[PDB]
Amino acid sequence: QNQYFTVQENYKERFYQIPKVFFTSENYKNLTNDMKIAYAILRDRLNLSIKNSWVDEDGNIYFVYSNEKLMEILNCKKEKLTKIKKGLENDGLLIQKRRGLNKPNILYLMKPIVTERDIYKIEKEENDVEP
């Protein structure tokens, strides 16, 4: 017979999403496990940013989080937060904007870049069947 929609099943199916290209691209080779996971967590927070009207003039969605709050969100210490921020920033996955004395710093999460090698590798992985 049919099954109900259950709250247990609903929360079993909630995820943090790490882009597959983080595992194929040479550009994202330097990323640590924490950097990848933190990137996924921030993406889920993107939906929170849309609720906060944290959308700029061009429709770009951003974060207005203090380092303390980011430490809370990512469950990490201060040094780790700095290392993660730098790692993502250097790979072009995070952009930091300063708005001056009047305002707190803005954080922009960025989509990854995908090359033909990445596409080939992901296709290869996603269609690896047998015999």
What are the residues binding a second copy (CB under 8 A)?
Answer: 1-8, 10-12, 14-21, 23, 33-34, 36-37, 40, 43-48, 50-52, 55, 58-61, 75, 92-93, 108-114, 118-119, 122, 125-130
Residues in contact with 28: Cβ distance below 8 Å, sequence separation at least 6, in sequence order = 21, 22, 91, 93, 112
**In the complex, least distance from residue 90 CB atom to a second copy, rounded to whole angstroms:** 12
Distance CA 101, CA 93 (A): 26
Using DSSP, state whether 10 is helix, strand or coil.
Answer: helix
Please, which residue, 78 or 124, has the CB nearer to a second copy?
A: 124
Q: Fill in the amino acid letter for 121.
A: K
**In the complex, least distance from residue 12 CB atom to a second copy, rounded to whole angstroms:** 5
Please, which residue, 71 or 110, has the CB nearer to a second copy?
A: 110
**In the complex, least distance from residue 76 CB atom to a second copy, rounded to whole angstroms:** 12
Distance CA 30, CA 87 (A): 8
**In the complex, least distance from residue 100 CB atom to a second copy, rounded to whole angstroms:** 20
Distance CA 30, CA 32 (A): 6
